[PDB]
């Protein structure tokens, strides 16, 4: 229940890739679509393209999968100075030994070690019973490959019944005492305008 304008969203970090699916990056403000769900996190650079709608990979099936019919898109910028530490900021990490392929948009929270069946490891964390996660490094200096990239994935729904963010923007100036057409708020008409 607010208006959203990404015209001011042009001003951001120079590292800015804005590609979207199902809608061109210009016609959203005029549209009157329903609610939108966002979530964001900072990632090693190389796989910012490995995250996309519904393709294979190590990261796609474990923590986040993106539906193919993806109404919405990703916004990525560079936060290396916001993230990297001299000794390395050890704060980010991802699932590494999930015994399944995680589907798009389901809650996947767990902290117990992975177990490959076979023999009952029973929480020893030895062989064939590994603990996933295995955090990143975030070196103070590194190439764009492991550069922490702040990426937000945003998905807005449709079906037009729960009007949530919606449209009407781009107002126009006024005319008076002249035969003109008009659309004041959704109603169309023509004629002359007078002080009433």
């Amino acid at each position, epitope marked *: 229940n607010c208006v959203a304008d990404y015209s001011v969203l042009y001003n951001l970090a120079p590292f800015f890739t804005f590609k979207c699916y199902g809608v061109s990056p210009t016609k959203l403000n005029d549209l009157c679509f329903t609610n939108v769900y966002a979530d964001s996190f900072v990632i090693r650079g190389d796989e910012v393209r490995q995250i996309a709608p519904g393709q294979t990979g190590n990261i796609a099936d474990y923590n986040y999968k993106l539906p193919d019919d993806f109404t919405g898109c990703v916004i990525a910028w560079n936060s290396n100075k916001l993230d990297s*530490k001299v*000794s*390395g*900021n*050890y*704060n980010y*990490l991802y699932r590494l030994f999930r015994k399944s392929n995680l589907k798009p948009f389901e809650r996947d*929270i*767990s*902290t*117990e*070690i992975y177990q490959a069946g076979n023999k009952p490891c029973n*929480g*020893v*964390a*030895g062989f064939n019973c590994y*603990f996933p*996660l*295995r*955090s990143y490094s975030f070196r103070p200096t590194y190439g764009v490959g492991h550069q922490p990239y702040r990426v937000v994935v945003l998905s807005f729904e449709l079906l037009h019944a729960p009007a949530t963010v919606c449209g009407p923007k781009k107002s126009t100036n006024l005319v008076k005492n002249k035969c003109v057409n008009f659309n004041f708020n959704g109603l169309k008409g023509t004629g002359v305008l007078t002080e009433s």
Partner: antibody
Amino acid sequence: QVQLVESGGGVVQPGRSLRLSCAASGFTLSSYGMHWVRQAPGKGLEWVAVISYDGSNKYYVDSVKGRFTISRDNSKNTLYLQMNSLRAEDTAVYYCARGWAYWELLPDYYYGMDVWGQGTTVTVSS
Amino acid sequence: QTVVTQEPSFSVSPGGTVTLTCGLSSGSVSTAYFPSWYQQTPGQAPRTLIYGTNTRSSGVPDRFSGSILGNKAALTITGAQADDESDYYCVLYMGRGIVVFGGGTKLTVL
């Protein structure tokens, strides 16, 4: 000032109960997690009772499962550690440490124990 | 259940650099274990020193720094001082609130 003061220490006979009180000053209990640490003299500290900021779930150690209960009062920022089935080896110095807040988005296995008070010990002997 | 590997007590002259070690008996140590190093002055309240293996506590000098060494967590002390003689304890994290403490080391300063 941000402080956790433990009150209720003393001599409690074996097999009895006690509700150890923890009063917090300076900060809001509902916004941070707590850690209860048992520290016997001349030995190592040990983890007993921990509660999340929101009280959504309860975590303990195996030796204290179902024999110690920790409860909270967010209306007036108070903590009540209920002691049950006390034994002679429970005699240690207990510290309350403060866990990180949800105001900073931190991952799971929540990190804590950043600041703590003087602590208070218990005495269980007959 | 796992046990953290620690040494009972150290004896190092003031002004020097010493290493404190804590490792995992169940396997190699990764930074996901969240090693933490605290000093325990006997009979008093501990003071936060190291959390996250790479961050100090507020106001702590540049002397007590932690790190990772093979399958061991390493805490580095540069410029030992008479107050540094104290009991030291490590914390390792098993998911969703299992903090583990090892043997503890009495770092005495000669």
